[PDB]
Amino acid sequence: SFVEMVDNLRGKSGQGYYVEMTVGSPPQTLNILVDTGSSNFAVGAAPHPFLHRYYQRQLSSTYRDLRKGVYVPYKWEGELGTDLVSIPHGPNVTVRANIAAITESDKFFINGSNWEGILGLAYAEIARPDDSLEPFFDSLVKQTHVPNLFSLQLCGAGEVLASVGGSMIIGGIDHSLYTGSLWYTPIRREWYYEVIIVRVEINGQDLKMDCKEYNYDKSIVDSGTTNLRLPKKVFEAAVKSIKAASSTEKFPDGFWLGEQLVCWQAGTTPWNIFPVISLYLMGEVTNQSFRITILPQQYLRPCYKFAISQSSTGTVMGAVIMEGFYVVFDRARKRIGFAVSACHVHDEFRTAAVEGPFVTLDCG
Numbered sequence: 205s206f207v208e209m210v211d212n213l214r215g216k217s218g219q220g221y222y223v224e225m226t227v228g229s230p231p232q233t234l235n236i237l238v239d240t241g242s243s244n245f246a247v248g249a250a251p252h253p254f255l256h257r258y259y260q261r262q263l264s265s266t267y268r269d270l271r272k273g274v275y276v277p278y279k280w281e282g283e284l285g286t287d288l289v290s291i292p293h294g295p296n297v298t299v300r301a302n303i304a305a306i307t308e309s310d311k312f313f314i315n316g317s318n319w320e321g322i323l324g325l326a327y328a329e330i331a332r333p334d335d336s337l338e339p340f341f342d343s344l345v346k347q348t349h350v351p352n353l354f355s356l357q358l359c360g361a362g363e364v365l366a367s368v369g370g371s372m373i374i375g376g377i378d379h380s381l382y383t384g385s386l387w388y389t390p391i392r393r394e395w396y397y398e399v400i401i402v403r404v405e406i407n408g409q410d411l412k413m414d415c416k417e418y419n420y421d422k423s424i425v426d427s428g429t430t431n432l433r434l435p436k437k438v439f440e441a442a443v444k445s446i447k448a449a450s451s452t453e454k455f456p457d458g459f460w461l462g463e464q465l466v467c468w469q470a471g472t473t474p475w476n477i478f479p480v481i482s483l484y485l486m487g488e489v490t491n492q493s494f495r496i497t498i499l500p501q502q503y504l505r506p507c508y509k510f511a512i513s514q515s516s517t518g519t520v521m522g523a524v525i526m527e528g529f530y531v532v533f534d535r536a537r538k539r540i541g542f543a544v545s546a547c548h549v550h551d552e553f554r555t556a557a558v559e560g561p562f563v564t565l566d567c568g
C-alpha cells in the first residue's frame with residue numbers, strides 16, 4: 205500500500221529531504237537524506253557537533269564489519285560493514301545493505317538539518333570506495349520482490365528555515381501524487397541519473413544554444429542538490445534573460461549570484477514579473493522531447509534566495525526543479541518520468557507543467 209509511504213519525507217528548506225530509516229538490531233532510528241546524486245548509504249556513526257543521534261554499531265547484534273575503510277574528500281570518512289535496514293514508512297521489508305559508518309567528517313553534516321546520514325539512490329558506478337560496494341537500492345531490489353523503481357514527490361514549503369514535505373514511493377508509482385501525463389526521458393547512463401536536455405526557454409524564449417551546452421559535461425536529476433545548477437555559459441544566458449524579464453524592479457547582483465536574499469513584505473511578491481523556465485528533456489523517441497516548466501515559485505526559494513546557480517560539473521536539476529513535479533526513477537526501464545505534482549506550488553495564472561511531445565529535425 206503506497207498510501208503508507210505518502211508524506212514519508214521531511215526536511216528544512218535548502219537542507220534536503222530525509223526519510224526515516226532504521227538500522228541494526230534493535231532498530232536504531234535515523235533520519236536519512238534522500239540523495240539521487242550519490243550512491244552510498246553513509247551514516248553518522250560517531251559523535252559530531254551537528255549530530256543529535258548516530259548509528260552505533262556496537263549496539264547492533266546484526267552488524268557485520270567489512271574490515272574496509274572509506275575516504276571521501278570533495279570530507280567524510282568511515283568504515284564499511286553491513287546491517288539490517290528498514291524504512292518504517294516504506295516497503296514492509298528488511299534488507300541487509302552496506303553501510304558507511306562515518307567516523308570523521310568535515311563540512312559533511314549540516315547544522316539543524318535533522319538528518320544523520322545519506323541514502324545514495326544512484327548507481328554502483330559512482331559508489332565509494334568503488335563500484336563493488338552495492339548501493340542500498342540494488343540490495344533492496346535483489347533481496348526483496350520490490351520493483352526496480354522509485355518515485356519522488358518533493359513539495360517544498362508553500363524564524364526557522366521553512367519545513368518541507370514530500371513522498372518517496374518505493375517500488376512503484378502513486379497516481380494520486382500527480383496529474384496529467386507522465387513523460388519519460390531516458391537515463392543516458394546508469395551512474396548518476398543522467399539525462400539529456402535538448403532545449404531550454406525563458407518565458408517561451410529559446411536560449412538558442414547548442415544543446416551540448418545544456419549537458420556539459422552532463423545533466424543529472426539530483427534530489428541531494430537544492431538549486432538548478434547550470435553550466436557556466438547556460439547560467440549566464442539564463443540569468444541575463446531572467447534579469448531582462450524582471451527588468452521592472454532591480455536586484456543586487458549579490459542576489460543573482462544566489463548568496464543574497466530579496467524581500468517583499470508580505471504576500472506582495474511580484475511573481476508575475478519573473479518568467480517561467482522550460483527545460484526540454486530528450487524523449488524516449490529519438491527526435492522527440494517534452495518540456496518541464498517551472499515557476500519563480502520554485503527557483504526563488506524562501507524573503508527569497510535565487511535558487512539557480514553556476515555549475516562546473518554540468519546541469520543539476522536539484523530540488524527546486526523536482527519540486528514542481530512527481531519524478532519517477534524507473535530504473536527497470538532506464539528512464540525518468542515527470543508529471544505535474546499534486547503538490548506543486550502555483551498561482552492563478554501560471555502553473556508548473558509537463559508537456560509533450562515537441563519535435564526536432566547529439567546533445568550528450
Ligand SMILES: Nc1cccc(Cn2c(-c3ccc(Oc4cncnc4)cc3)ccc2-c2ccccc2Cl)n1
Nearest residue numbers: 218219220239241242244246312322332426428429430
Ligand atoms: N547530490 C550530491 C552532490 C554532492 C555530494 C553528495 C553527497 N555528499 C555530501 C553531501 C552532504 C550533505 C548534503 O546536504 C544537502 C545539501 N544541500 C541540499 N540538500 C542536501 C548534500 C551532499 C558530502 C559528500 C558527499 C559525497 C561525495 C561523493 C560520494 C558520496 C558522497 Cl555521500 N550528494
